[model samples]
Target: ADQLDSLAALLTSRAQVQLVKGLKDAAGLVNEAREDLGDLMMSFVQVTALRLLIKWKVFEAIPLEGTISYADVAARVGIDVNLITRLSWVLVATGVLKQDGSDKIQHTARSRPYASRNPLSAMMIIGFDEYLPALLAMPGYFDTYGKKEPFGEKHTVKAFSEGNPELTVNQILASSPERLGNMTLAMAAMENMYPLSGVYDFSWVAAKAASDSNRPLIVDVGGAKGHTLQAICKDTPALPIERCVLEDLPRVIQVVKDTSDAGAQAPQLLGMDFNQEQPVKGAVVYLIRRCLHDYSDEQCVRILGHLAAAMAADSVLLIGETVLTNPPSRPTAMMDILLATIGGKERTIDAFGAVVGRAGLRIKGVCKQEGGDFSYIECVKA
Candidate 1:
């Protein structure tokens, strides 16, 4: 027994010494491993945790009024106490929530944003729920599609000839209607949260272009429900309503008309596909936000060509998109590769310039925003 205890003590001592020397490195390795595993397992812990917190109103429940018991929280959110307890543990572990004594929990500084009665909170939860599922399913889709010959040939060729073949492609593939709806909702939520009102300065474009010079129409091609244009108009009151036009599906336009009666300044909804000819001409500023990235370079160039043909000699086309940079470090770019299943590829500045040039446009300038991958590029017809 004495010899056995001594052997055990020696092993324990060795382990302690190794741990003391390598603890930080070991922890980092573990973290990296966890992230790798997360990438493989579809374990969106951060998003899932946020969803639970939002679903449970955890942030709102813990106010200046004080913390609440787990039981009370469970009752309020219509969840079982056991599930609440398990989820609350995750929140506390992640530093979003704090536990006081044995029974009550409250919000930490990080939790404030989740509970705020603002668009940001709504956008985060709703947007994540909207896109994450489709993203989760993309890997399997690529695995199946990548092996086939012609390599997305059918979709690309049809879009190439037809100019705007979103519906046709979707129908043929029997694509996930749920994912489509989610994507639209996610985009609308994001636009709602971060409207390009006072956030960006349009005075630069406004100064160079004439008032009668087409009034700088913010033509949102493929804009759904005109939510983005609505946000822009609301934020920038100086922008005349008549100047904003949203081009989308006929059914989408009909829905926009019924849901919103904000009048003419609310953007005229037109049924037109960008793959086809652009109907509105003499547009001083042709705005394509979150659209081009949905197509391959050839298709994007074709669409850009149509827009270019419609532009005045000095008219600017502002593309609001995430411009890829060297090193390709952002999560969105990596996520973008998966977006190819839906027929889009993120482009770098050089890549964007090449596409723009092919379409007979020149990149005049690019502006980076404070959050996410959103950037504004100013382009003009060559």
Candidate 2:
């Protein structure tokens, strides 16, 4: 009996130790999973908080050296003080704004560029405002679609436009137009941020081509508000203004003219639609950026065909966009999914080549810029 009792006690002690070790392992795994979830949640919080800051013009109102009470910020923006206070907690947490002993908030280095008084600051907000709402609506949109499928199955810009044409117009007028304008300004600011002063190297391409002494005309088809041309001029010291042109819808052209008043370096804004036909011909370079990704292959081919018909035999077509990589993984890949949700899909080089070839253009070379997320694909008449 004594021996049996000793054996039972030994077994119980062993079992208890094993159980404790098992519980520790499970607890460790749970903590690790929790940490991962916390990271993801924080990312969402930061992005949403930044969007709110832009909406509230917090960056613009508080200059780098400026300080304001939370009450004053809410009063200036016509938002609730409590909401501002809540947002400020996030900003402070992210190091965007610093809070003083008196609970006053001051702009940090991160907050300086977004100040309303700063031209670039408004530009950044405007650029983000263009797509932020749509991005925010995505989860709801996904829920409505009820499946993980390409957007073609459910929604598209054309379909959306057709169903609620007036609403679409209003949405673009209220959201996209100003956002596009701000995007142009933001692009210019981005160029300034770089050492080279411009994102696109028109000069590099320009120098490679035979000099026509008559400054080569850069035609930006579907260019919103001629922002690209504006940036090109702003960055290129000796760039001649007469050589730049911006083409868009008639209404968009009218808006550009009314708003821009032909800045000394401004390009001539022309009204044209590439999906139907291109009016301007003999462009030195037909520049299309962020336009092709918005449509299917057939639509893209048709748009490229318009440029093909308009191009001179020697003219080059510069396709500036994010090229989809094989087994797309990071930033571009993630963006490709978002683009897919809008019925736009990013294409691989081969896919792009096939589409461009259909339009009678041959891929010449690809110029990749440093440190940015997009590439410039050069194509010439086939």
Candidate 3:
């Protein structure tokens, strides 16, 4: 009765009643909830469908101009028609393909991406080839190592790393240039689901660029192949970098140097293990994007402090990472565990503060990407 009264009282305002009624209507919620639950319960079907679609070239085989029947798809991929029928239907049902009343599979705007064949096609190969084994072994990692967050160069071990005792994740990732390229490309794809300029103000760096055209305005710590430098420069060409510097390890640096030397103009590349002393000292902005989260607090402090030592009094450090909220978002929580299997973390704001404090830098401000899931933890000398 009390709850009913509260809602009845809202009607007196004459404004929020329809909104409340729309939200409170039980029948509407029940149907939506049912679909949500159904989607959750059978998410694996979509994953397998996508995998099979890629493996069999099902999407690519379909004529972009017209629909193909299941039988035709089967012949193209050399699969049994019945099997192809089921796989193709699942892809249609799951929004990957469209079906007409004529019973032919067609590409939707959604299916066009996979059909067009982009480098993102490497996504499935990376997922199944690299991440899946470790993901499946998560429970086993906990069983063996117990309940501890993995950290430190000496202490960190992942579900993937624990299995491959002969090599570390870096060693494994570095071994295949193709794999390295795919992972970075995929990371870039996911990261920019929202634009960087929308989320964090680069105008501070922009201002610096305008004021001091004599020196490099930004030093991108652990920036892989200087892609961020490219984006930042592309977005704000008026605030051109004197020479935006890209700092990463030797393997990544060598890749950029080769490209830069070949013809493509890239940022001035500096190869160094960033955990040690930061080489580019007193730049206007020290930008660390998606790098610090790969380590524990102690390890992060090492990276931050190293960079902090090199930062001049007015020089700024911008750390781009996702900040978790208290109640937790489902994707963010899943990502938190996903990285945990590999000894990294998606930090809570306070958790970020803990490391920044230890690094001898204080948070100047925290700014979110205006239309993205990430935030810039801006800092200055403590």
Ranking the candidates on lDDT from highest down gives 3, 2, 1
Instruction: Estimate TM-scores for all models.
Output: 0.67, 0.65, 0.80
**The candidate that achieves the highest TM-score relative to the unseen native structure:** 3
Best by lDDT: 3
Clashing pairs in 1: 163-275, 164-275, 241-265
Worst 10 residues of 3 by lDDT: 152-161
For residues 28-144, what per-residue lDDT tens digits would candidate 1 score against the true structure?
444676676765454366557778878667666667457889888877777788977877787787677888889898877777777864556655654465335445554454464
lDDT of each residue in 277-364, candidate 2, tens digit only: 8787787778887789877888889999989998998788988877766865355776676566357788888989999999999999
**Each model's lDDT:** 0.68, 0.69, 0.75
Against the hidden true structure, what lDDT does model 1 obtain? 0.68
Q: Model 2: how far is 382 from its true place, Å? A: 3.2
